[PDB]
Amino acid sequence: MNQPPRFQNYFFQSYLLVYEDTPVGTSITQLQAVDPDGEPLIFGVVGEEAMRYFAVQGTTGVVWLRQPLDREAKSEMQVEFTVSDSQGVVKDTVNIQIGDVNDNAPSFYNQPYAIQIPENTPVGTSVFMVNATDPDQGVGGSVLFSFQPPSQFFSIDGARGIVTVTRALDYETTIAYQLTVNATDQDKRRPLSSLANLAITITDIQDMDPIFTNLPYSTNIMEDAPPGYEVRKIRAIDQDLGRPRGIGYTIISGNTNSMFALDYISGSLTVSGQLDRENPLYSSGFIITVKATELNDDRTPSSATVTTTFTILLID
Ligand SMILES: [Ca+2]
Ligand SMILES: [Ca+2]
Ligand SMILES: [Ca+2]
Ligand SMILES: [Ca+2]
Ligand SMILES: [Ca+2]
Ligand SMILES: [Ca+2]
Ligand SMILES: [Ca+2]
């Protein structure tokens, strides 16, 4: 009594691994069967998808790949093979798993990457997160982030891609950082990587005292010089250039007999009294000190001040 053949390959009970990089023409396996009748057998494969991907040599059982594979497109196939004798056909299904190779670089997303942060951001603070996927499996899909070149002022966490400030920032030294993030997969035979720019703008904070312009201020004037005559226009600026504050100008000392007047807003230092060169109160001249004070929006004084001391002499 003729008996139908039986397939034997382990992979009918489990899966047949075919790596995605297998070239067209490669023999991916050989079907094996037993039949008790001393009779030739014919091997093949059925189904439109399977017959397009695989060729079976009728006579030997050898299975060949007809078509290129791509795990990231299709990771898996159900495939029915057949073995035939003089009596009929036997069919069994095989789950064919498409094995992964590291053939994709990491991809950044949510670009462009840029942030604005103020110069007083504390060391330790996390200011950005990069995002990247890699569709490969295992270590070939595991991403490590780093800065190339590395930064003295920022770090990025290898696994999480979180950027932190690692040294005190300062608008007065550096207003912009152009950093470069690297994303590398962990596949040790063939690693792959890609790059993204990260733009960090720095923002100004009031942390600089004002400073006097056009120094020095020591001036000689005619002893005859009348009331209203401008000795000098005094000028100071907020060194915080991003959102400067107004300045208030005062005379602190040495203005003997209220001889001079200093306009609070304009800095115009003028003669107010009648000059008398040899009066014993000021025969040596005037050693005047002047203060510029940064003002709050609402015109009340701040603590940011600067003083300069200069001499006014009187001439024949
Ligand atoms: Ca048979
Ligand atoms: Ca692929
Ligand atoms: Ca990869
Ligand atoms: Ca892959
Ligand atoms: Ca600063
Ligand atoms: Ca500042
Ligand atoms: Ca200031």
Beta-sheet pairing, 89-99 with 54-56: unpaired
What is the residue extent of each domain of the chain? 1-99, 100-207, 208-316
Return residues with CB closer than 5 A to ligand 6 (ion): 171, 204, 207, 240
Return residues with CB closer than 5 A to ligand 1 (ion): 2, 35, 37, 85
| Ligand in nearest proximity to the CA of 140 | 3
Q: Give the number of other Cβ atoms within 10 Å of residue 269's Cβ.
A: 24
Amino acid letter at 316? D
**Cα separation, 34 vs 80, whole angstroms:** 18
User: Chain centroid to CA 127: how far?
Assistant: 9
- The DSSP code for 258 is G
| Ligand in nearest proximity to the CA of 184 | 3
| Ligand in nearest proximity to the CA of 87 | 1
Tell the CATH topology of 100-207. Immunoglobulin-like (2.60.40)
**Cα separation, 295 vs 236, whole angstroms:** 12
Q: Is the dihedral of CA 253, 256, 257, 261 positive or negative?
A: negative
Q: Classify 49 as helix, strand or coil.
A: helix
| Ligand in nearest proximity to the CA of 187 | 3
Tell the CATH topology of 208-316. Immunoglobulin-like (2.60.40)
**Cα separation, 282 vs 92, whole angstroms:** 118
Tokens read off for 115: 């942030």
Choose among 273, 185, 190, 267: nearest CA to 225: 273
Beta-sheet pairing, 126-129 with 62-65: unpaired
Return residues with CB closer than 5 A to ligand 5 (ion): 170, 172, 207
**Cα separation, 67 vs 287, whole angstroms:** 96
Position of tokens 């004084």? 301
Choose among 244, 221, 241, 243: nearest CA to 231: 221
Q: How was this structure determined?
A: X-ray
CA of 130 to the centre of ligand 3 (A): 17
| Ligand in nearest proximity to the CA of 72 | 2
Q: Just give the CATH number of 1-99.
A: 2.60.40.60
What lies within 8 Å, CB to CB, of 218 at 6+ separation is 310, 311, 312, 313
CA of 70 to the centre of ligand 2 (A): 4
Burial of 191 (0-12, 13-18, 19+ CB in 10 A): middle
CA of 101 to the centre of ligand 4 (A): 4
CA of 9 to the centre of ligand 1 (A): 18
